[PDB]
Write a protein that binds this ligand. Structure first.
Ligand SMILES: CC(C)(C)[C@H](NC(=O)C(F)(F)F)C(=O)N1C[C@H]2[C@@H]([C@H]1C(=O)N[C@H](C=N)C[C@@H]1CCNC1=O)C2(C)C
Ligand SMILES: CC(C)(C)[C@H](NC(=O)C(F)(F)F)C(=O)N1C[C@H]2[C@@H]([C@H]1C(=O)N[C@H](C=N)C[C@@H]1CCNC1=O)C2(C)C
Lengths: 301, 301
């Protein structure tokens, strides 16, 4: 009953958050087994950000130039390397709170929980989504670098994101846990374009399905639409084109509500062209696109 | 950078979640020290909900009629009592994961994080607020009874809420950790009125202050307003009347943005009478009222 944008329980991730201090720069790290992961720009000063040569910058750094603080217990650094944009600091002591984990590169449109670490410690948790421009609309202040995005399958944590930078628009960019940036972004202080931020169409349909389950039906229309004609009005409104795969993913919601996928797309076409006229759907006046169909299925059962 | 409705890290609360099974009814409990707290309606069947005499119902129950499951370790019940609407089950083993905690009755308008326990285990976390009608707009399915609301001050957990029922409107009602319901609600299956759900005015002003800090200023107007004249247009739009205390709480945001409180109320008056004209503030077309001024201060520093 009721629909909320809830995140996974961050208990398994809080036990892996550490502080990495290189010189005067500090940020958060991920302590899994005997390796600490953090953005490689921790080794840069206020000047190096404009044009950093991370290879030349890391060469002048040694193992002892890294302060890894886990609450109060310091970790001895026995090795370091650079995998793309992530810094892998091998420590002596393995984390006893290491959960079952794996690394995964998340596709645009998929959601994940973010443990935002303000003021040098786990401070908040929220649910967000990977936008088509490979940016996220989150909440990151100074000291939030190293904040990780993750998903939890029963007992396994799927770490997928690590925050690095904020675009001049205010949106955020980051990498996966193997160092590769999501999008055409590079860890360097310079004006970078994000690109057109289209709307995840399959997530919007999943949110409309969640509205029917929760009682809101005013938007249910008396029309239908084909797949190509819906995509015609989709490109005009900066919506991603719907594919037959997206129809298959929305399978369980169509069978649970008795509303076919193409009928739901027909309704969505009317909301784009006519607006909501001030009305609300699930307490919002905007088509929400931060709910994957798997998130709706999880919460509605 | 960026504004999100983030919740506190639920790591300290997950270690206190247990399953309480009385007969065929199961729900979640709060294992603090050697006491387990849960809604007292766990002892009711499907029929007792219509007209329960909890005293007569609890008399026919003994210590062994309560299955307290903490993951896999069962807890031996050595005592039980009824404090208003909460069931205090004294167990033999004290919870080793018991954090520094205390109980607090939250005032309407204040926010707190909720660890929603779907399917018999901690499943999600979200931030919500106590509405003026003492209800909350959350996400609670069957088996969510026993889900707790809490706030975290550095190391101390302030447990303030426990979910019990859902109103026929879909909104949720609950009690504090001493058993007293928030509002005129009673644990009994019968049509109960929630009352007029006014808008927390001080929270809306705090959200507008957060919009100025984040760059959105289109709503900043060129007028001012007194306190009594703003309350005149406040009652018309189902907004709570602003008091001089509310002005004092908004102190830090006015001194940080250089915008006086009465000037911010002047802007808010224009949004109520003219709407947003389809525009957005912090990515929303509705005046958000689930951010206390302390939440904005926490996230904007
Ligand atoms: C806009 C800015 C000029 C700051 C820059 N932006 C671009 O370079 C862009 F234009 F490409 F975005 C940027 O983000 N950084 C500068 C530099 C990293 C990152 C950075 O130091 N960030 C802060 C470090 N703790 C955390 C931020 C600050 C506020 N809130 C946060 O979370 C790197 C790209 C290597
Ligand atoms: C609407 C209903 C008739 C169900 C009733 N409502 C009213 O009695 C009211 F009209 F007062 F609201 C109600 O909530 N309950 C019946 C009964 C308790 C509660 C209840 O058994 N709840 C479920 C138990 N696990 C969890 C719910 C179900 C869906 N999602 C949830 O979270 C008590 C008031 C003692």
């Amino acid at each position: 009953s009721g629909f909320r944008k809830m995140a996974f329980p961050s208990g398994k991730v809080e036990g892996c958050m550490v502080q990495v201090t290189c010189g005067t720069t500090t940020l958060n790290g991920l302590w899994l087994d005997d390796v600490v992961y953090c953005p490689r720009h921790v080794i840069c000063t206020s000047e190096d950000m404009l044009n950093p040569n991370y290879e030349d910058l890391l060469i002048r750094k040694s193992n002892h130039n890294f302060l890894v603080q886990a609450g109060n217990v310091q970790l001895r650094v026995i090795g370091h390397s650079m995998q793309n944009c992530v810094l892998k600091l091998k420590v002596d002591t393995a984390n006893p709170k290491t959960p079952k984990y794996k690394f995964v590169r998340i596709q645009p449109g998929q959601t994940f929980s973010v443990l935002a670490c303000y003021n040098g410690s786990p401070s908040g948790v929220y649910q967000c989504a990977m936008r088509p421009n490979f940016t996220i609309k989150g909440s990151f202040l100074n000291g939030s670098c190293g904040s990780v995005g993750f998903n939890i399958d029963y007992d396994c944590v799927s770490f997928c994101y690590m925050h690095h930078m904020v675009l001049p628009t205010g949106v955020h960019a980051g990498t996966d846990l193997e160092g590769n940036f999501y999008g055409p972004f590079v860890d360097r202080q310079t004006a970078q374009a994000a690109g057109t931020d289209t709307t995840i169409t399959v997530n919007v349909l999943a949110w409309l399905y969640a509205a029917v389950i929760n009682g809101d039906r005013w938007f249910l229309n008396r029309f239908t639409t084909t797949l190509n004609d819906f995509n015609l009005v989709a490109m005009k409104y900066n919506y991603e084109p719907l594919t037959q795969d997206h129809v298959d993913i929305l399978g369980p919601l169509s069978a649970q509500t008795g509303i076919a996928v193409l009928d739901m797309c027909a309704s969505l076409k009317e909301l784009l062209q006519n607006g909501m006229n001030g009305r609300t759907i699930l307490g919002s006046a905007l088509l929400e696109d931060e709910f994957t169909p798997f998130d709706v299925v999880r919460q509605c059962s």
